Design a protein around this ligand. Structure first.
Ligand SMILES: C[S@@+](CC[C@H](N)C(=O)[O-])C[C@H]1O[C@@H](n2cnc3c(N)ncnc32)[C@H](O)[C@@H]1O
Ligand code: SF4
Ligand code: SF4
Ligand code: SF4
Ligand SMILES: [Cl-]
Ligand SMILES: [Cl-]
Length: 364
């Protein structure tokens, strides 16, 4: 099967989230993806894929490409899916531009949607402000309400900053109040290769430790009271515990090629690494196999197989596996270092492992 991460509005965005290094306003934007580039990609994937394929739309804010772009996508998928493959479409959105038309489209076409929401109003608005400085929380709530009204399948993407670590109670309680049961807490990354921990929002290892421990306590109490809440990190640990492998990139110890496609058709191995040094080629000119077998992609993946010496002697290695490579990549052109959050995982596991096992045993 083939899975692509597409940026149909490139890095363009209507917000300027304080911690965000993905958006163009003080990052290269290639503008909105042209129809001919979109068709070239869709035709290719559906010609080359076996079994099924997946198209994920991110950025940047992908809804800036407009609804017609997405209706064209669906027409092109129908046009070119001559093998009758199952297709999985998804979208990650800031939600601010979602209206009834969008919600109907997303429901009817069975998109899985990730909606970015950092917590209740003040926690969310602290960092997630629009390009004119305005608060955005009410608009994101409006999106969630529309998704609920129109039956859109969605989950929540919450960035974990230092402020999140000081207010796990408020964040957890808010999501619980809204009955959001599918949550993904994303460690806030400082910009690649910059000195770490320098911003007011920076998630330092001690902050992450505090975050993990308290989040786990809330989640486990819910588990004990028969309230199932899905948290992606914990689900991934459970997969590793029960299956020896996780469905989430960054928890299996080595990298994968994610086939990130910019709006000009240029392809990259990972959405953290949309940079000229990791440009694989252009989806209009190269087969997916070709892109995968480029020395740049081979190098990208092979770099990730190096195991730090501490991990070799770590009692948690089989559970942690060294974490995501992006958290090990401290300086350009340099060998990977020990995971930035190593100490956080170690103190979290001491605190939570036995209870994790209990959960693992009760879900078979
Ligand atoms: C880059 S956005 C693109 C899609 C859409 N604009 C949105 O905000 O959901 C995808 C996800 O990355 C998250 N993100 C942004 N900056 C981040 C950072 N520095 N570290 C970790 N995640 C970040 C966003 O909050 C969002 O959940
Ligand atoms: S809305 Fe998404 S892409 Fe835009 S600045 Fe915020 S996190 Fe970045
Ligand atoms: S850097 Fe992390 S998210 Fe990207 S491919 Fe490697 S493990 Fe996966
Ligand atoms: S906890 Fe630290 S030493 Fe142990 S495997 Fe994870 S990163 Fe390596
Ligand atoms: Cl608001
Ligand atoms: Cl998570």
């Amino acid at each position: 099967p083939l899975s692509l991460l597409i940026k149909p509005a490139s890095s363009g965005c209507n917000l300027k989230c304080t911690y965000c290094f993905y958006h163009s306003l003080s990052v290269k934007s290639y503008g909105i993806m042209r129809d001919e580039v979109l068709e070239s990609m869709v035709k290719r994937v559906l010609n080359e894929a076996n079994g099924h394929c997946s198209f994920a739309f991110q950025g940047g804010e992908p809804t800036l490409a407009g609804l017609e772009f997405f209706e064209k996508l669906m027409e092109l998928q129908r046009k070119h899916n001559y093998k009758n493959l199952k297709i999985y479409n998804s979208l990650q959105t800031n939600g601010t531009l979602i209206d009834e038309s969008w919600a109907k489209f997303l429901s009817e076409n069975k998109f899985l949607v990730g909606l970015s929401m950092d917590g209740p109003k003040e926690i969310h608005n602290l960092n997630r402000k629009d390009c004119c400085g305005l608060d955005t929380f009410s608009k994101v709530e409006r999106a969630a309400e529309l998704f609920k009204k129109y039956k859109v399948e969605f989950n929540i993407l919450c960035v974990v900053t230092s402020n999140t670590a000081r207010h796990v109670n408020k964040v957890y309680k808010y999501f619980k109040e809204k009955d959001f049961k599918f949550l993904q807490f994303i460690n806030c990354l400082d910009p690649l290769y910059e000195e770490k921990g320098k911003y007011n929002y920076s998630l330092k290892p001690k902050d992450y430790t505090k975050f993990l421990k308290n989040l786990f306590d809330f989640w486990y109490e819910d588990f004990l009271n028969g309230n199932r809440v899905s948290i992606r990190y914990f689900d991934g640990l459970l997969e590793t515990i029960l299956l020896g492998k996780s469905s989430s990139c960054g928890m299996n110890g080595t990298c994968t090629c994610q086939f990130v496609v910019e709006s000009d058709g240029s392809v990259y191995p990972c959405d953290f690494y949309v940079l000229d040094k990791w440009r694989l080629g252009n989806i209009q000119d190269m087969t997916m196999k070709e892109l995968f077998e480029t020395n740049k992609n081979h190098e990208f993946i092979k770099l990730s197989f190096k195991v730090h010496e501490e991990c070799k002697k770590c009692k948690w290695f089989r559970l942690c596996k060294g974490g995501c490579r992006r958290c090990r990549d401290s300086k350009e052109d340099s060998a990977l270092e020990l995971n930035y959050y190593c100490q956080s995982y170690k103190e979290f596991f001491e605190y939570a492992f036995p209870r994790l096992i209990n959960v693992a045993n009760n879900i078979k």
